[PDB]
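Design review, sub-item: ligand-bound model
Attendees: FS, YL, KQ
YL presented the inputs for the adenosine-5'-triphosphate complex:
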Amino acid sequence: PCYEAVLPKEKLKVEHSREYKQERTYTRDLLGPTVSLTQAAFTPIPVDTSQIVLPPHLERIREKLAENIHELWVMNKIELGWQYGPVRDDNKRQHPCLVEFSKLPEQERNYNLQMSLETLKTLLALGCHVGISDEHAEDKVKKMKLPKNYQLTSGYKPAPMDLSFIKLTPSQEAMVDKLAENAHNVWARDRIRQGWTYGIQQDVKNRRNPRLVPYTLLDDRTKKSNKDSLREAVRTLLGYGYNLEAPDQDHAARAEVCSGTGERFRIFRAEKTYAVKAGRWYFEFETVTA
Ligand SMILES: Nc1ncnc2c1ncn2[C@@H]1O[C@H](COP(=O)(O)OP(=O)(O)OP(=O)(O)O)[C@@H](O)[C@H]1O
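KQ shared the predicted structure:
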């Protein structure tokens, strides 16, 4: 049905195909060239990173980095209420993910590894160089006690130094936003290869999912969920000694050059017969938008 193509925020209305309708001449809204609706087609595009090569420091740090961050999100879900179980049904509150990376299912371990690799490759394609400050930041295992019953079976508690001691700059928040953008785009392209397409209501048999939407249009709940996850990811990436310097805020306004067709402006004028050659005249112009 055609009602399934409505964008989430907008409401379905039946409006004139052309701009101008019947109204008062002084209330008539004169419109200029409208902007092109390129956003209508949600074509995700991740930043290309296959050509990029990982620097030596990150390629020998990542493996224990990858396992440590894996244990970090398994605690995040444990705090959220995740429970280990023999069965594979997450909705039934049973999953074998609590085990270590080696004991982890090979396909899950592979996922965690390309996502570590793609997070680092996105970090390095972001224009943000990262380097380790000192080895003491990794040598220190300053640890706060947490209840054993509330913790998992494994004695090694992945809970690192409390995150309040680390700080997140506006540039850090900016790169977290772009990293979340790239992760969303990659996931969307994955479902597109799977054959999934956008819909107003989720249909597993029809491969319809409302989340196949541009990130700015995405729901605030998944926005904040993925944003916080990548937030602890980046914060641990700093607390582990590796300091990173964001590119400075570069503001290059596009000035809305892109527009429908090649029209730059539209000119409105009275009829030539009303030309005034003498006298003193006055008329008003109202600016709806600056
Ligand atoms: N690392 C993970 N592996 C598997 N499931 C996860 C993981 N992290 C979270 N989940 C749970 O499974 C869901 C995975 O959905 P996601 O949008 O990431 O893609 P998907 O695996 O293709 O979809 P789904 O499992 O929902 O059909 C999450 O919404 C969450 O409930």
